Amino acid sequence: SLALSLTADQMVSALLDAEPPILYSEYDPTRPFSEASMMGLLTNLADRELVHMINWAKRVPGFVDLTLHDQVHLLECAWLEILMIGLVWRSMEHPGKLLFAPNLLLDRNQGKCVEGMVEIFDMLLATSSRFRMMNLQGEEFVCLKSIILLNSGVYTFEEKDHIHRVLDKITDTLIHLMAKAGLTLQQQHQRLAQLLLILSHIRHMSNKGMEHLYSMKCKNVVPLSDLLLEMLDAHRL
């Protein structure tokens, strides 16, 4: 496995290079927001982001070593967590707002447009605030995003052993980054823990987001694409 063979610097470079682009939304300022139109913008954006994610995932060391069924499973379990951590990262330099896209920057009040949405906005904003508080680095962000991909569905499966080997390698990588940044050994494990504990909150937000998406579907608020319907169905709500 070339994955297990990578140095820390090589792992970081591979991850940084695999990063998807920031996409634009279909926002049209000529019409007022409604619940349905905001949900339409967000689901359309998610659909576009998902295609780039699928191809990003293939570039995460170790991922293509798995069977298609395991790849499907990991992405099915983690897709919304991955979208969310990306959103939170994009939004770091915009306190009080969520940068869904460069032409779609929303505050919590605009979140109220959609039933049950502001609660999720609030959690994402608190997570972005936490990233700011910690001065989360770009190199740390990409490690965290790959950890989510490999970890979230791993407990719902040799293949497992391989996944855990890749995860250990990403841990070594995070430690390497912190050491190179001048953190003391004690600060190293403290920060590693702070970062990984955020993943519990991201899991929580994803779970609530999945419940919210299911509610929008069940109330016919917005047409969901076939991809989103299958990603949602995987969580069997």
């Binding site: 295609v51 699928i54 293939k58 298609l68 790849q71 499907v72 992405l75 099915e76 076939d226 991809l227 299958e230 990603m231």
Partner: peptide, 9 residues
């Protein structure tokens, strides 16, 4: 399933 197809594309 769509995701299955997309992973091969």
């Amino acid at each position: 399933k769509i995701l299955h197809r997309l992973l091969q594309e």
